[PDB]
Amino acid sequence: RICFNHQSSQPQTTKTCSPGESSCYHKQWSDFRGTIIERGCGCPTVKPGIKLSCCESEVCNN
């Protein structure tokens, strides 16, 4: 499987999900900079208001 590991707009770099991690996660939410988009494997925790779309499909978090 695979999961993007960058932020905002930049030469997207891919990281092969590590053991245990079998899903990708996309954390998107606007802040004081504009549009912040975190991404990677291992659906982390978030705060009420931020969106986290997890998908058990390779490359699913831009």
CSV table of all heavy atoms in Angstrom, one decimal:
chain,number,residue,atom,x,y,z
A,1,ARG,N,0.9,-1.2,0.0
A,1,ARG,CA,0.0,0.0,0.0
A,1,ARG,C,0.9,1.2,0.0
A,1,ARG,O,2.1,1.2,0.2
A,1,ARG,CB,-0.9,0.0,1.3
A,1,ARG,CG,-2.3,-0.1,0.8
A,1,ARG,CD,-3.2,0.1,2.1
A,1,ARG,NE,-4.7,-0.2,1.7
A,1,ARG,CZ,-5.2,-1.3,1.8
A,1,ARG,NH1,-5.4,-1.8,3.0
A,1,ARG,NH2,-5.4,-2.0,0.7
A,2,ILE,N,0.3,2.4,-0.2
A,2,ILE,CA,1.0,3.6,-0.2
A,2,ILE,C,0.2,4.8,0.4
A,2,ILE,O,-1.0,4.7,0.5
A,2,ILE,CB,1.4,4.0,-1.7
A,2,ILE,CG1,2.5,3.1,-2.2
A,2,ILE,CG2,1.9,5.5,-1.7
A,2,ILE,CD1,2.8,3.4,-3.6
A,3,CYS,N,1.0,5.8,0.8
A,3,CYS,CA,0.3,7.0,1.4
A,3,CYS,C,1.2,8.2,1.2
A,3,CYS,O,2.4,8.2,1.5
A,3,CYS,CB,0.1,6.8,2.9
A,3,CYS,SG,-1.2,5.5,3.4
A,4,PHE,N,0.6,9.3,0.8
A,4,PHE,CA,1.4,10.5,0.6
A,4,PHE,C,1.9,11.1,1.9
A,4,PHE,O,1.2,11.0,2.9
A,4,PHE,CB,0.5,11.6,-0.1
A,4,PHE,CG,0.3,11.2,-1.6
A,4,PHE,CD1,-0.9,10.8,-2.0
A,4,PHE,CD2,1.4,11.1,-2.4
A,4,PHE,CE1,-1.0,10.3,-3.3
A,4,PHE,CE2,1.3,10.7,-3.7
A,4,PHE,CZ,0.1,10.3,-4.1
A,5,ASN,N,3.0,11.7,1.9
A,5,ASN,CA,3.6,12.2,3.2
A,5,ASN,C,4.0,13.7,3.1
A,5,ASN,O,5.1,14.0,3.6
A,5,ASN,CB,4.8,11.4,3.6
A,5,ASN,CG,5.9,11.5,2.6
A,5,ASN,OD1,6.3,12.6,2.2
A,5,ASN,ND2,6.4,10.4,2.1
A,6,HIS,N,3.3,14.5,2.5
A,6,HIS,CA,3.7,16.0,2.4
A,6,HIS,C,2.6,16.9,2.9
A,6,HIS,O,1.7,16.5,3.6
A,6,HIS,CB,4.0,16.3,0.9
A,6,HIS,CG,3.2,15.3,0.0
A,6,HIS,ND1,2.2,15.6,-0.6
A,6,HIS,CD2,3.5,14.1,-0.2
A,6,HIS,CE1,1.8,14.6,-1.3
A,6,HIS,NE2,2.5,13.6,-1.1
A,7,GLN,N,2.7,18.1,2.5
A,7,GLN,CA,1.6,19.1,2.9
A,7,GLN,C,1.4,20.2,1.8
A,7,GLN,O,2.2,20.4,1.0
A,7,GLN,CB,2.2,19.9,4.1
A,7,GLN,CG,1.8,19.2,5.4
A,7,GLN,CD,0.5,19.9,6.0
A,7,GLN,OE1,0.4,20.1,7.2
A,7,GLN,NE2,-0.4,20.3,5.2
A,8,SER,N,0.2,20.7,1.9
A,8,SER,CA,-0.2,21.7,0.8
A,8,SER,C,0.3,21.3,-0.6
A,8,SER,O,0.2,20.2,-0.9
A,8,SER,CB,0.5,23.1,1.2
A,8,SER,OG,-0.2,24.0,0.4
A,9,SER,N,0.7,22.3,-1.3
A,9,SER,CA,1.2,22.0,-2.7
A,9,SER,C,2.7,21.8,-2.8
A,9,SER,O,3.4,22.8,-2.6
A,9,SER,CB,0.8,23.1,-3.6
A,9,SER,OG,1.2,22.7,-4.9
A,10,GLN,N,3.2,20.7,-3.1
A,10,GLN,CA,4.6,20.4,-3.2
A,10,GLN,C,4.9,19.0,-3.8
A,10,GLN,O,4.1,18.2,-3.7
A,10,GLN,CB,5.2,20.5,-1.7
A,10,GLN,CG,4.6,19.3,-0.9
A,10,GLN,CD,5.7,18.2,-0.8
A,10,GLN,OE1,6.5,18.3,0.1
A,10,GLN,NE2,5.7,17.2,-1.6
A,11,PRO,N,6.0,18.8,-4.4
A,11,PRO,CA,6.3,17.6,-5.1
A,11,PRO,C,5.9,16.4,-4.2
A,11,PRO,O,6.7,15.9,-3.4
A,11,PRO,CB,7.8,17.6,-5.3
A,11,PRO,CG,8.3,19.1,-5.1
A,11,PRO,CD,7.1,19.9,-4.6
A,12,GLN,N,4.7,16.0,-4.3
A,12,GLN,CA,4.2,14.9,-3.5
A,12,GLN,C,5.2,13.7,-3.3
A,12,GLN,O,5.6,13.1,-4.3
A,12,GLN,CB,2.9,14.3,-4.2
A,12,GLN,CG,3.3,13.6,-5.5
A,12,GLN,CD,2.2,13.9,-6.5
A,12,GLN,OE1,1.8,15.0,-6.8
A,12,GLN,NE2,1.6,12.9,-7.1
A,13,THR,N,5.4,13.4,-2.1
A,13,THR,CA,6.4,12.3,-1.8
A,13,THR,C,5.5,11.1,-1.2
A,13,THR,O,4.7,11.3,-0.4
A,13,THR,CB,7.4,12.7,-0.7
A,13,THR,OG1,6.7,13.7,0.0
A,13,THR,CG2,8.5,13.5,-1.4
A,14,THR,N,5.8,9.9,-1.7
A,14,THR,CA,5.0,8.8,-1.2
A,14,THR,C,5.8,7.9,-0.2
A,14,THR,O,7.0,7.6,-0.4
A,14,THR,CB,4.6,7.9,-2.4
A,14,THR,OG1,5.7,7.8,-3.2
A,14,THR,CG2,3.6,8.8,-3.2
A,15,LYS,N,5.1,7.4,0.8
A,15,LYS,CA,5.7,6.6,1.8
A,15,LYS,C,4.9,5.3,1.9
A,15,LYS,O,3.7,5.3,2.1
A,15,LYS,CB,5.5,7.3,3.2
A,15,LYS,CG,6.9,7.5,3.8
A,15,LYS,CD,6.8,8.3,5.1
A,15,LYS,CE,6.1,7.3,6.1
A,15,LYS,NZ,6.6,7.6,7.5
A,16,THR,N,5.6,4.2,1.8
A,16,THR,CA,4.9,2.9,1.9
A,16,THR,C,4.5,2.7,3.4
A,16,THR,O,5.3,2.7,4.3
A,16,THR,CB,5.9,1.8,1.5
A,16,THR,OG1,5.4,1.4,0.2
A,16,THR,CG2,5.7,0.5,2.4
A,17,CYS,N,3.2,2.5,3.6
A,17,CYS,CA,2.7,2.3,4.9
A,17,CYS,C,3.6,1.3,5.7
A,17,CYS,O,3.9,0.3,5.2
A,17,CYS,CB,1.3,1.8,4.9
A,17,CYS,SG,-0.1,3.0,4.7
A,18,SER,N,3.9,1.7,6.9
A,18,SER,CA,4.7,0.8,7.8
A,18,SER,C,3.9,-0.3,8.3
A,18,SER,O,2.7,-0.3,8.3
A,18,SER,CB,5.3,1.7,8.9
A,18,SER,OG,4.7,2.9,8.7
A,19,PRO,N,4.5,-1.3,8.9
A,19,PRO,CA,3.8,-2.5,9.5
A,19,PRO,C,2.7,-2.0,10.4
A,19,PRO,O,2.9,-1.0,11.0
A,19,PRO,CB,4.9,-3.3,10.2
A,19,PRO,CG,6.3,-2.7,9.8
A,19,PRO,CD,6.0,-1.4,9.0
A,20,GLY,N,1.7,-2.8,10.6
A,20,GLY,CA,0.6,-2.4,11.5
A,20,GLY,C,-0.3,-1.3,10.8
A,20,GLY,O,-1.5,-1.4,10.8
A,21,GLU,N,0.3,-0.4,10.2
A,21,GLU,CA,-0.4,0.7,9.4
A,21,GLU,C,-1.0,0.1,8.1
A,21,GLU,O,-0.2,-0.1,7.2
A,21,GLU,CB,0.5,1.8,9.1
A,21,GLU,CG,-0.1,3.1,9.5
A,21,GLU,CD,-0.1,3.3,11.0
A,21,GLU,OE1,-0.9,2.7,11.6
A,21,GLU,OE2,0.8,4.0,11.5
A,22,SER,N,-2.3,-0.1,8.1
A,22,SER,CA,-2.9,-0.7,6.9
A,22,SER,C,-3.9,0.3,6.3
A,22,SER,O,-4.8,-0.1,5.5
A,22,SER,CB,-3.6,-2.0,7.2
A,22,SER,OG,-3.4,-2.1,8.6
A,23,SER,N,-3.7,1.6,6.6
A,23,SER,CA,-4.7,2.6,6.0
A,23,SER,C,-4.0,3.9,5.8
A,23,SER,O,-3.1,4.2,6.5
A,23,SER,CB,-5.8,2.7,7.0
A,23,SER,OG,-6.1,4.1,7.0
A,24,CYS,N,-4.6,4.7,5.0
A,24,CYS,CA,-4.1,6.1,4.7
A,24,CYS,C,-5.0,7.1,5.4
A,24,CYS,O,-6.1,6.8,5.7
A,24,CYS,CB,-4.1,6.3,3.2
A,24,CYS,SG,-2.7,5.8,2.1
A,25,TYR,N,-4.5,8.3,5.6
A,25,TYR,CA,-5.3,9.3,6.3
A,25,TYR,C,-5.1,10.7,5.7
A,25,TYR,O,-3.9,11.0,5.4
A,25,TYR,CB,-5.0,9.3,7.8
A,25,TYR,CG,-3.8,10.1,8.1
A,25,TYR,CD1,-3.8,11.5,8.2
A,25,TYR,CD2,-2.5,9.5,8.3
A,25,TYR,CE1,-2.7,12.3,8.4
A,25,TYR,CE2,-1.4,10.3,8.5
A,25,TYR,CZ,-1.5,11.7,8.6
A,25,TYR,OH,-0.4,12.4,8.9
A,26,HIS,N,-6.1,11.4,5.6
A,26,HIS,CA,-6.1,12.8,5.0
A,26,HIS,C,-6.6,13.8,6.0
A,26,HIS,O,-7.8,13.7,6.3
A,26,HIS,CB,-6.9,12.8,3.7
A,26,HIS,CG,-6.9,14.3,3.2
A,26,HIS,ND1,-7.8,14.8,2.5
A,26,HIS,CD2,-5.9,15.2,3.3
A,26,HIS,CE1,-7.4,16.0,2.2
A,26,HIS,NE2,-6.3,16.4,2.7
A,27,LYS,N,-5.8,14.6,6.5
A,27,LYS,CA,-6.2,15.6,7.5
A,27,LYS,C,-6.3,17.0,6.9
A,27,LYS,O,-5.3,17.6,6.7
A,27,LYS,CB,-5.2,15.6,8.7
A,27,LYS,CG,-5.9,16.0,10.0
A,27,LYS,CD,-4.9,16.0,11.1
A,27,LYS,CE,-5.3,17.0,12.2
A,27,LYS,NZ,-4.3,17.1,13.2
A,28,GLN,N,-7.5,17.4,6.6
A,28,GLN,CA,-7.6,18.8,6.0
A,28,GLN,C,-8.4,19.7,6.9
A,28,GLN,O,-9.4,19.4,7.4
A,28,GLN,CB,-8.4,18.6,4.6
A,28,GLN,CG,-8.7,20.0,4.1
A,28,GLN,CD,-8.8,20.0,2.6
A,28,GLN,OE1,-8.8,18.9,2.0
A,28,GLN,NE2,-9.0,21.1,1.9
A,29,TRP,N,-7.9,21.0,6.9
A,29,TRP,CA,-8.6,22.0,7.8
A,29,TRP,C,-7.9,23.3,7.6
A,29,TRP,O,-6.7,23.5,7.6
A,29,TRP,CB,-8.5,21.6,9.2
A,29,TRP,CG,-7.1,22.0,9.8
A,29,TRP,CD1,-6.9,23.2,10.4
A,29,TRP,CD2,-6.0,21.2,10.0
A,29,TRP,NE1,-5.6,23.0,10.9
A,29,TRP,CE2,-5.0,21.9,10.6
A,29,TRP,CE3,-5.8,19.9,9.5
A,29,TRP,CZ2,-3.8,21.3,10.9
A,29,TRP,CZ3,-4.6,19.3,9.8
A,29,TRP,CH2,-3.6,20.0,10.5
A,30,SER,N,-8.7,24.3,7.4
A,30,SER,CA,-8.2,25.7,7.2
A,30,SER,C,-7.8,26.3,8.6
A,30,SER,O,-8.4,26.0,9.6
A,30,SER,CB,-9.3,26.6,6.6
A,30,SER,OG,-8.7,27.9,6.6
A,31,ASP,N,-6.8,27.1,8.5
A,31,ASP,CA,-6.3,27.8,9.8
A,31,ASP,C,-5.9,29.2,9.6
A,31,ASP,O,-6.6,30.0,8.9
A,31,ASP,CB,-5.0,27.0,10.3
A,31,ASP,CG,-4.8,27.3,11.7
A,31,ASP,OD1,-5.2,28.4,12.1
A,31,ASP,OD2,-4.1,26.5,12.4
A,32,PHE,N,-4.8,29.6,10.1
A,32,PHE,CA,-4.3,31.0,9.9
A,32,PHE,C,-3.5,31.2,8.7
A,32,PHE,O,-3.1,32.3,8.3
A,32,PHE,CB,-3.6,31.5,11.1
A,32,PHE,CG,-2.1,31.4,10.9
A,32,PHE,CD1,-1.3,32.5,10.5
A,32,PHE,CD2,-1.4,30.2,11.0
A,32,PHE,CE1,0.0,32.4,10.2
A,32,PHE,CE2,0.0,30.1,10.8
A,32,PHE,CZ,0.7,31.2,10.4
A,33,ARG,N,-3.1,30.1,8.1
A,33,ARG,CA,-2.2,30.1,6.9
A,33,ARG,C,-3.1,30.0,5.6
A,33,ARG,O,-2.7,30.4,4.6
A,33,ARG,CB,-1.3,28.9,6.9
A,33,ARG,CG,0.1,29.4,7.3
A,33,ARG,CD,1.1,28.3,7.3
A,33,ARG,NE,1.5,27.9,5.9
A,33,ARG,CZ,2.5,27.1,5.8
A,33,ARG,NH1,3.7,27.4,6.3
A,33,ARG,NH2,2.3,26.0,5.1
A,34,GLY,N,-4.2,29.4,5.8
A,34,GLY,CA,-5.1,29.2,4.6
A,34,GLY,C,-5.7,27.8,4.6
A,34,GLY,O,-6.7,27.5,5.3
A,35,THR,N,-5.2,26.9,3.8
A,35,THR,CA,-5.7,25.5,3.7
A,35,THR,C,-4.6,24.6,4.1
A,35,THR,O,-3.6,24.3,3.4
A,35,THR,CB,-6.1,25.2,2.3
A,35,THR,OG1,-6.9,26.3,1.9
A,35,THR,CG2,-6.9,24.0,2.2
A,36,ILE,N,-4.7,24.0,5.3
A,36,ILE,CA,-3.6,23.1,5.8
A,36,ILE,C,-4.1,21.6,5.5
A,36,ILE,O,-5.2,21.2,5.9
A,36,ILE,CB,-3.5,23.3,7.3
A,36,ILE,CG1,-2.4,24.3,7.6
A,36,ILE,CG2,-3.1,22.0,8.0
A,36,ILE,CD1,-2.3,24.7,9.0
A,37,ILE,N,-3.3,20.9,4.8
A,37,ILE,CA,-3.6,19.5,4.5
A,37,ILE,C,-2.5,18.5,4.9
A,37,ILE,O,-1.5,18.3,4.3
A,37,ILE,CB,-3.8,19.3,3.0
A,37,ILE,CG1,-5.2,19.9,2.6
A,37,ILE,CG2,-3.7,17.9,2.6
A,37,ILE,CD1,-5.1,20.4,1.2
A,38,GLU,N,-2.7,17.9,6.1
A,38,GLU,CA,-1.7,16.9,6.6
A,38,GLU,C,-2.1,15.6,5.9
A,38,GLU,O,-3.2,15.4,5.5
A,38,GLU,CB,-1.8,16.8,8.1
A,38,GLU,CG,-0.5,17.2,8.7
A,38,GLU,CD,0.6,16.1,8.2
A,38,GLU,OE1,0.3,15.0,8.6
A,38,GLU,OE2,1.5,16.5,7.6
A,39,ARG,N,-1.1,14.7,5.9
A,39,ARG,CA,-1.4,13.4,5.2
A,39,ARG,C,-0.4,12.3,5.7
A,39,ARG,O,0.6,12.6,6.2
A,39,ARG,CB,-1.3,13.6,3.7
A,39,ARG,CG,-0.3,14.7,3.4
A,39,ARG,CD,0.0,14.8,1.9
A,39,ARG,NE,-1.1,15.5,1.3
A,39,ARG,CZ,-0.8,16.5,0.4
A,39,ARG,NH1,-0.3,17.6,0.8
A,39,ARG,NH2,-0.9,16.2,-0.9
A,40,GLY,N,-0.7,11.1,5.3
A,40,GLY,CA,0.2,10.0,5.7
A,40,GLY,C,-0.5,8.7,6.1
A,40,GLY,O,-1.7,8.6,6.0
A,41,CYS,N,0.2,7.8,6.6
A,41,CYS,CA,-0.5,6.5,7.1
A,41,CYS,C,-0.6,6.4,8.6
A,41,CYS,O,0.3,6.8,9.3
A,41,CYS,CB,0.4,5.3,6.6
A,41,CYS,SG,-0.4,3.7,6.5
A,42,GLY,N,-1.7,5.8,9.1
A,42,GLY,CA,-1.8,5.7,10.6
A,42,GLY,C,-2.8,6.8,11.1
A,42,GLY,O,-2.4,7.6,11.9
A,43,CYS,N,-4.1,6.7,10.6
A,43,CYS,CA,-5.1,7.7,11.1
A,43,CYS,C,-4.8,8.2,12.5
A,43,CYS,O,-5.2,7.6,13.5
A,43,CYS,CB,-6.4,6.9,11.1
A,43,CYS,SG,-7.0,6.3,9.5
A,44,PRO,N,-4.2,9.4,12.6
A,44,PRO,CA,-3.9,9.9,13.9
A,44,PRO,C,-5.1,10.6,14.6
A,44,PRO,O,-6.2,10.5,14.0
A,44,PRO,CB,-2.9,11.1,13.7
A,44,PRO,CG,-2.7,11.2,12.1
A,44,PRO,CD,-3.6,10.1,11.5
A,45,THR,N,-5.0,11.1,15.7
A,45,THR,CA,-6.2,11.8,16.4
A,45,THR,C,-6.3,13.2,16.0
A,45,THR,O,-5.3,13.8,15.6
A,45,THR,CB,-6.0,11.7,17.9
A,45,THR,OG1,-4.8,10.9,18.1
A,45,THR,CG2,-7.1,10.9,18.5
A,46,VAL,N,-7.4,13.8,16.1
A,46,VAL,CA,-7.6,15.2,15.7
A,46,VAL,C,-8.6,15.9,16.7
A,46,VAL,O,-9.0,15.3,17.7
A,46,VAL,CB,-8.3,15.2,14.3
A,46,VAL,CG1,-7.5,14.4,13.4
A,46,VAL,CG2,-9.7,14.7,14.4
A,47,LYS,N,-8.8,17.2,16.5
A,47,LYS,CA,-9.7,17.9,17.4
A,47,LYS,C,-11.0,18.2,16.7
A,47,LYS,O,-11.1,18.3,15.5
A,47,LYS,CB,-9.0,19.3,17.7
A,47,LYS,CG,-7.8,19.0,18.7
A,47,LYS,CD,-7.1,20.3,18.9
A,47,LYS,CE,-6.6,20.4,20.4
A,47,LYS,NZ,-6.0,19.1,20.1
A,48,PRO,N,-12.1,18.4,17.4
A,48,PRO,CA,-13.4,18.7,16.9
A,48,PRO,C,-13.4,19.9,15.9
A,48,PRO,O,-13.0,21.0,16.3
A,48,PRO,CB,-14.3,19.0,18.1
A,48,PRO,CG,-13.5,18.8,19.4
A,48,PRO,CD,-12.1,18.3,18.9
A,49,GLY,N,-13.7,19.6,14.7
A,49,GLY,CA,-13.7,20.7,13.6
A,49,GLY,C,-12.8,20.3,12.5
A,49,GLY,O,-13.1,20.6,11.3
A,50,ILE,N,-11.7,19.6,12.8
A,50,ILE,CA,-10.8,19.1,11.7
A,50,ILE,C,-11.4,17.9,11.0
A,50,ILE,O,-12.0,17.0,11.6
A,50,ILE,CB,-9.5,18.8,12.3
A,50,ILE,CG1,-9.0,20.0,13.1
A,50,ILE,CG2,-8.4,18.6,11.2
A,50,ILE,CD1,-7.6,19.8,13.7
A,51,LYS,N,-11.1,17.7,9.7
A,51,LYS,CA,-11.6,16.5,9.0
A,51,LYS,C,-10.5,15.5,8.8
A,51,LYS,O,-9.4,15.8,8.5
A,51,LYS,CB,-12.1,17.0,7.6
A,51,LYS,CG,-13.5,17.7,7.8
A,51,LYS,CD,-13.9,18.3,6.4
A,51,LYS,CE,-15.4,18.6,6.4
A,51,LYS,NZ,-15.7,19.5,7.5
A,52,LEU,N,-10.9,14.2,8.9
A,52,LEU,CA,-9.9,13.2,8.7
A,52,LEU,C,-10.6,12.0,7.9
A,52,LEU,O,-11.3,11.3,8.4
A,52,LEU,CB,-9.5,12.6,10.1
A,52,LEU,CG,-8.5,11.5,10.0
A,52,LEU,CD1,-7.2,12.0,9.3
A,52,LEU,CD2,-8.1,10.9,11.3
A,53,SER,N,-10.2,12.0,6.7
A,53,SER,CA,-10.8,10.9,5.8
A,53,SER,C,-9.8,9.7,5.7
A,53,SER,O,-8.8,9.8,5.0
A,53,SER,CB,-11.0,11.5,4.4
A,53,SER,OG,-11.6,12.8,4.7
A,54,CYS,N,-10.2,8.6,6.3
A,54,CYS,CA,-9.3,7.4,6.2
A,54,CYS,C,-9.8,6.4,5.1
A,54,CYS,O,-11.0,6.2,5.1
A,54,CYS,CB,-9.3,6.7,7.6
A,54,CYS,SG,-8.4,7.6,8.9
A,55,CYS,N,-8.9,5.9,4.4
A,55,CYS,CA,-9.3,4.9,3.3
A,55,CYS,C,-8.3,3.8,3.2
A,55,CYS,O,-7.1,4.0,3.1
A,55,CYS,CB,-9.4,5.7,2.0
A,55,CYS,SG,-8.8,7.4,1.9
A,56,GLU,N,-8.8,2.6,3.2
A,56,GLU,CA,-7.9,1.4,3.2
A,56,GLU,C,-7.5,1.2,1.7
A,56,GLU,O,-7.3,0.1,1.3
A,56,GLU,CB,-8.7,0.2,3.6
A,56,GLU,CG,-9.3,0.5,5.0
A,56,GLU,CD,-9.9,-0.7,5.6
A,56,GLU,OE1,-10.3,-1.6,4.9
A,56,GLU,OE2,-9.9,-0.7,6.8
A,57,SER,N,-7.3,2.3,1.0
A,57,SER,CA,-6.8,2.2,-0.4
A,57,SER,C,-5.5,2.9,-0.6
A,57,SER,O,-5.4,4.1,-0.2
A,57,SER,CB,-7.9,2.8,-1.3
A,57,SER,OG,-7.9,2.1,-2.5
A,58,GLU,N,-4.6,2.3,-1.3
A,58,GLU,CA,-3.3,3.0,-1.5
A,58,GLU,C,-3.5,4.4,-2.0
A,58,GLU,O,-4.6,4.8,-2.5
A,58,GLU,CB,-2.5,2.2,-2.6
A,58,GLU,CG,-3.5,2.0,-3.8
A,58,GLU,CD,-2.6,1.7,-5.0
A,58,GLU,OE1,-1.5,1.2,-4.9
A,58,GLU,OE2,-3.1,2.0,-6.1
A,59,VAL,N,-2.5,5.3,-1.8
A,59,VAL,CA,-2.6,6.7,-2.3
A,59,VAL,C,-4.1,7.2,-2.2
A,59,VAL,O,-4.8,7.1,-3.2
A,59,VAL,CB,-2.1,6.8,-3.7
A,59,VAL,CG1,-0.5,6.9,-3.7
A,59,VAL,CG2,-2.5,5.6,-4.5
A,60,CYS,N,-4.4,7.7,-1.1
A,60,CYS,CA,-5.8,8.3,-0.9
A,60,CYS,C,-5.9,9.5,-0.1
A,60,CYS,O,-6.9,9.9,0.4
A,60,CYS,CB,-6.7,7.2,-0.3
A,60,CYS,SG,-6.8,7.3,1.5
A,61,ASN,N,-4.7,10.1,0.1
A,61,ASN,CA,-4.6,11.4,0.9
A,61,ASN,C,-3.7,12.4,0.2
A,61,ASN,O,-2.6,12.4,0.4
A,61,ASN,CB,-4.1,11.0,2.2
A,61,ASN,CG,-2.9,10.0,2.1
A,61,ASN,OD1,-3.1,9.0,1.4
A,61,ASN,ND2,-1.8,10.2,2.7
A,62,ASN,N,-4.3,13.3,-0.6
A,62,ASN,CA,-3.5,14.3,-1.2
A,62,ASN,C,-3.5,15.6,-0.4
A,62,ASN,O,-3.7,15.5,0.8
A,62,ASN,CB,-4.2,14.6,-2.6
A,62,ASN,CG,-4.1,13.3,-3.5
A,62,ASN,OD1,-3.2,13.1,-4.2
A,62,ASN,ND2,-5.0,12.4,-3.4
